[PDB]
Write a protein that binds this DNA or RNA. Structure first.
Ligand code: ATP
Ligand code: ATP
Ligand code: MG
Ligand code: MG
Ligand code: ZN
Lengths: 418, 644
DNA sequence: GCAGATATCACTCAGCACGA
DNA sequence: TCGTGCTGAGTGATATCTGCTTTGGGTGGGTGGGTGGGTTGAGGCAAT
């Protein structure tokens, strides 16, 4: 393992981050208040705005006490600064002010008993991630902030699945596309908790990969001094879980080069951002582009090719009354005033649908427009049919193969009538 | 020892020729200033290397595995020494970005084809020319991982290797990230400071013509990495230079039992040489303005297109008008007034319908000649498809969708099946296609123009019947076509002689180059007769009759324009002129429409045609306002298109 | 490099007979 | 009456070892990949 001398210092960057969370002021410090809210169990998501980091950096430089460029460091390698920010928050966390319940806290009784036992044994602990109950997310650097302070924004600059190459791996980038598949929320384990039937001691194991190997024999100092072969058994009541969703994002029709087919990019959503993406939606998702190293024998036979994915961090969504509201059904069309009145009545769908002891009366005003070619029917039809929030323009034949009402077809692959 | 000697030799060679040093300096300066990114690559000519040193040239040509890496190292050392970057970045310091090499010039017997590649050419540099058929997805490949040890505060790194990444073989390195340091300290992978390169595998197929009679084509796989990742698409013709290699155990390992199959052979690509719009210069705009001012340009442009064809001048005029289209209006209510003309040709056999289609295809920026009779290949309209076994749903775009803001030249419109008729009706009426099948909901624009040809139902056009009777499509389909043209094959002795002689000329015309009439058989990739056309009796022919006004005796040589400049004219007009209707033209528009409707079924939609063609013609005159002349000429053209 | 099925060797313990 | 040194015996931990595929099929997928392979034919039912 030959070593290189990279021009990055992590102690100085950690000190800068610690100072940032205790000095920034967009009321007391913004992030101190945000953390105070979390300690009261009122907030479960802290979002770090890189615009704030840029503002703090420029304020420090203006005073003459220039420091390292934290913003560029975060984007160039983002998977490492999540840990740094979490550690800083843990170190500078404030004590709660509002009385908490503390009644049904499994990982408070467990920890209290673990402290009591450890103190009694020593007189004669747990991984940091286990106690964390907040999620840290990064907000990209907005273009306005970058242009204000004479800098270029790489994270916010939208890209396409075509432009996401291997050079961008490990950075905070934005992707523009249409969601084409979403999965059900499932619990992805982060810290497994075991219990020894002999010691009464709990063993915590961190899992940070697609696969893990469960523990069998207790590793507690009690099972070591006595050399008892106690067996560890998994307990899902004390473990830590995070909501997990897997989605797919595809390129828009405006980004595919001629003669090429659209590509798809997998997206992983963890924490509270889950359920913010739905099928058939245009979004601007910012996340960390990371690989997924293989494990086991698959690693040897797979080769050097790496399967990658996106870790979502931020999501942005691309969003006489009678006579007057009648002559406005299709201002462009000229005549047919009474017809337009009738179409307005259709739009209102005027009814107070009545259901008594079972009888149902339809509440739909059907209308037909016969005549001869040339009179403005189709133009009227598409205008009236666009006006409504929901509409479907189709020919008398029907929507493609299936005709108007419905039809049962043999499944091409499963050969089941659907 | 030998490696150092070859590195020194290539350093001396690079020193001798300053062009490559200048190229490297230029690339480095451009990269530094732009801090869209120039790749680290240099193209050397094998002829220069042969002139400088024959031994190195022969070694590269016959033993690339032992002679190429030294050249790459020499170039990398030269670039690093020449580099003057004051402050690098963590990304740059740890990046594994050496300088690659590519070759041009003349090859000897190494210029082969996929069929001629045999086992005797392995471990040699070759140049393969063929057609791309497959193109795998672009994937990242790991070549270096950098880790951080918090306890010791030091950055470690490790390099990986694969058979498809290096010409010289080494022990495979499995893709397992180091987890603990040698001293035992735990490591954390730094993903942002690692190095990943792209990887793509393509298959090149022998050119069909070179294929021996009664033999299926042969194909060879090619591997491309880094910058040469997305440069080819299926169907393109390429000339790939690379090193032919053999990979894998090929059954030699005891695990396999076939004992007959051979090894797997591919090519490690070094470079790819490929085998729309013309950027207008300063004086080209002056030329186009000069032609525009001339108050006869409409005839010149109309008859420049398809100069060979005799007669049918009004069709040529209408085709140019269609090509330049009309302004498209988008009202605040979301209403979309169509602004693209459509033309349908119906006539007896042998009236150059296919010739007109070919000429519009050649002169049109976009076009797809998807015949209406079982359009195998690309369908007329979009239709989702699924795999036989995997059932991989996917929306396959048809011809109409693949012509957005362009043109689609359908052929044999009379052979369409009911499915195509129903699809086309909706496509033209709405200008957009919304797919709601197989759990797929999407909308795809289809704004374009349609030109089609349709033969009669009885094989010959009957004058006594209406055009809607000689064609057997419902009024819904025919109404969408703005202008309908009926053309008949008339027999005139002089016309017969002219057509006969013109067709005969080509047969006696020959492939000049070999004993006349006998068994018949790019230099670079990077990259006023010009405007007007000299008269040619062989090609133009009838174009002279056009200016003569149907007089064969007339010897008025016309002022025809070459197609390449006509394309520029249409491009400039379509991308810069947005005419606005004017009152002077509008009085005549209203009067003409009223006269048509009330006096010798004409429909209100014909009014749209008048305005559309008025704007289209105003675009020809290079004016931002539609004038009376444009309206009058459009009205006359419509009158001809309606009444003979 | 990793998990599982398998067999090898070395170390320590309860019984035994004799001598104190 | 009894105390202790020598012995055979049997587990415990650890050494080498094989194996790390495997498999025909679409509720295992196609960012696992085709040098790991998959090559029907009759009968029933909707559309018309
Ligand atoms: N009162 C009117 N005001 C404005 N435009 C009109 C009016 N009456 C007719 N038109 C024009 O008549 C043309 C007729 O084409 P359109 O698309 O309406 O076909 P249609 O005959 O109504 O359709 P279909 O018979 O297929 O249902 C349209 O361009 C429309 O603009
Ligand atoms: N006006 C013309 N001037 C010169 N040649 C002409 C003219 N009209 C027709 N031809 C000749 O007609 C020949 C037949 O052309 P083409 O095969 O395209 O006919 P078509 O009518 O489109 O065919 P189809 O009846 O099969 O649809 C062409 O070789 C062309 O030389
Ligand atoms: Mg209609
Ligand atoms: Mg023809
Ligand atoms: Zn235990």
């Amino acid at each position: 393992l030959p070593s290189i001398q990279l021009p990055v210092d992590y102690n100085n960057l950690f000190n800068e981050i610690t100072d940032f969370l205790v000095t920034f002021k967009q009321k007391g410090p913004k992030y101190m208040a945000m953390l105070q809210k979390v300690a009261n169990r009122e907030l479960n998501s802290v979002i770090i705005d890189l615009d704030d980091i840029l503002q703090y950096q420029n304020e420090k430089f203006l005073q003459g006490t220039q420091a390292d460029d934290l913003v560029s460091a975060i984007q160039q390698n983002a998977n490492h600064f999540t840990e740094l920010f979490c550690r800083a928050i843990d170190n500078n966390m404030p004590l709660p002010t509002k009385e908490i319940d503390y009644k049904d806290d499994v990982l408070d009784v467990i920890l209290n008993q673990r402290r009591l036992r450890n103190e009694r044994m020593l007189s004669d602990l747990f991984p940091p991630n286990l106690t964390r109950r907040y999620f840290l997310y990064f907000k990209p650097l907005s273009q306005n902030c970058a242009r204000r302070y004479r800098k270029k924004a790489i994270s916010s600059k939208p890209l396409s699945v075509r432009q996401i190459k291997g050079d961008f791996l490990g950075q905070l980038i934005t992707v523009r596309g249409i969601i084409t598949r979403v999965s059900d929320v499932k619990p992805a384990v982060e810290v497994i908790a075991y219990t020894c039937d002999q010691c009464g001691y709990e063993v915590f194991q961190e899992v940070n990969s697609r696969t893990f190997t469960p523990l069998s024999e207790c590793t507690s100092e009690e099972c070591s001094q006595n050399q008892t072969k106690g067996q560890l058994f998994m307990s899902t009541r004390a473990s830590k879980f995070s909501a997990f969703q897997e989605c797919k994002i595809q390129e828009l029709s405006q980004q595919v080069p001629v003669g090429h087919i659209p590509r798809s990019l997998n997206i992983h959503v963890n924490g509270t951002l889950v359920r913010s993406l739905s099928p058939g939606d245009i979004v601007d998702v910012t996340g960390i582009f990371l690989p997924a190293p293989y494990t086991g024998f698959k690693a040897l036979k797979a080769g050097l090719l790496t399967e990658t994915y996106l870790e979502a961090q931020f999501v942005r969504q691309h969003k006489d009354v009678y006579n007057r509201l009648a002559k406005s059904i299709a201002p462009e069309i000229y005549g047919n005033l009474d017809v337009k009145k009738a179409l307005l009545l259709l739009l209102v769908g005027g009814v107070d649908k009545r259901v008594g002891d079972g009888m149902k009366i339809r509440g739909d005003i059907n209308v037909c427009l016969m005549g001869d070619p040339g009179v403005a029917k189709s133009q009227l039809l598409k205008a009236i049919c666009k006006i409504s929030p929901r509409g479907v323009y189709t020919t008398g034949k029907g929507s493609s193969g299936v005709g108007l009402t419905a039809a049962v077809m043999k499944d091409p692959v499963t050969d089941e009538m659907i | 020892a030998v490696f150092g000697d070859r590195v020194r030799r290539f350093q001396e060679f690079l020193d001798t020729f300053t062009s490559y040093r200048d190229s490297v300096r230029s690339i480095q300066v451009y990269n530094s200033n732009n801090a869209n990114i120039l790749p680290h690559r240099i193209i050397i000519s094998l002829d220069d290397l042969r002139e400088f040193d024959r031994s190195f040239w022969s070694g590269i040509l016959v033993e690339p595995a032992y002679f190429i890496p030294p050249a790459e190292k020499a170039l990398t050392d030269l670039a690093d020494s020449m580099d003057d970057v004051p402050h690098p970045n963590a990304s740059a310091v740890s990046s594994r970005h050496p300088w690659k090499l590519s070759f041009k010039g003349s090859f000897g017997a190494h210029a082969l084809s996929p069929r001629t590649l045999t086992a005797q050419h392995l471990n040699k540099l070759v140049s393969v020319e063929g057609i791309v058929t497959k193109t795998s997805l672009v994937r990242p490949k790991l070549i270096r991982s950098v880790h951080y040890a918090a306890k010791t505060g030091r950055f470690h790194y490790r390099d990986y290797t694969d058979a498809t990444t290096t010409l010289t073989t080494r022990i495979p390195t499995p893709a397992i990230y180091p987890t603990e340091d040698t001293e035992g300290n735990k490591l954390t992978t730094e993903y942002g400071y690692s190095t990943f390169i792209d990887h793509q595998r393509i298959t090149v197929q022998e050119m069909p013509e070179m294929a021996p009679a009664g033999q299926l084509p042969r194909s060879i796989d090619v591997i491309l990495d880094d910058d040469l990742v997305d440069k080819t698409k299926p169907g393109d013709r390429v000339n790939v230079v690379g090193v032919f290699k053999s990979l894998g155990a090929g059954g030699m390992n005891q695990s396999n039992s076939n004992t007959l199959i051979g090894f797997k052979t591919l090519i490690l690509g070094n470079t790819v040489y490929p085998l729309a719009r013309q950027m207008l210069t300063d004086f080209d705009i002056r030329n186009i303005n000069k032609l525009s001012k001339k108050k006869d340009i409409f005839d010149i442009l109309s008859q420049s297109l398809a100069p060979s064809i005799y007669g049918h001048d009004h069709i040529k005029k209408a085709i140019l008008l269609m090509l330049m289209g009309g302004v498209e209006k988008n009202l605040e209510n979301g209403s979309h007034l169509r602004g693209d003309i459509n033309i349908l040709m119906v006539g007896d056999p042998s009236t150059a319908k296919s010739q007109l289609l070919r000429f519009v295809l050649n002169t049109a920026s976009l076009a797809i000649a998807t015949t209406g009779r079982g359009s195998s290949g690309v369908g007329l309209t979009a239709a989702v498809t699924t795999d036989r076994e995997t059932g991989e749903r996917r929306l396959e775009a048809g011809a109409m969708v693949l012509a957005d803001r362009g043109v689609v030249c359908i052929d044999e419109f009379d052979k369409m099946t009911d499915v195509d008729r129903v699809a086309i009706h909706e496509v033209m009426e709405q200008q957009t296609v919304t797919i709601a099948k197989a759990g797929i909901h999407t909308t795809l624009n289809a704004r374009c123009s349609v030109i089609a040809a349709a033969n009669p139902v009885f094989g010959q056009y009957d004058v006594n019947r209406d055009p809607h009777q000689n064609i057997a499509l419902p009024d819904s389909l025919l109404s969408r076509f703005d202008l309908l043209f009926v053309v008949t094959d008339d027999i005139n002795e002089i016309r017969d002689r002219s057509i006969s002689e013109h067709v005969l000329r080509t047969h006696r015309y020959l492939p000049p180059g070999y004993l006349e009439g006998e068994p018949v058989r790019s230099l670079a990739v990077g990259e006023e007769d010009h405007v007007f056309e000299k008269f040619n009796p062989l090609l133009q022919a009838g174009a002279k009759l056009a200016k003569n006004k149907g007089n064969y005796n007339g010897t008025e040589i016309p002022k025809l324009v070459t197609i390449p400049f006509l394309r520029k004219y249409v491009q400039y007009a379509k991308e810069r002129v947005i005419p606005q209707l004017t009152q002077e033209a509008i009085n005549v528009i209203v009067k003409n429409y009223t006269d048509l409707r009330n006096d010798d079924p004409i429909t209100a939609r014909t009014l749209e045609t008048l305005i559309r063609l008025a704007t289209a013609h105003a675009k020809v005159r290079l004016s931002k306002t539609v004038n009376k002349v444009d309206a009058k000429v459009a009205a006359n053209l419509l009158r001809f298109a309606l009444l003979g």
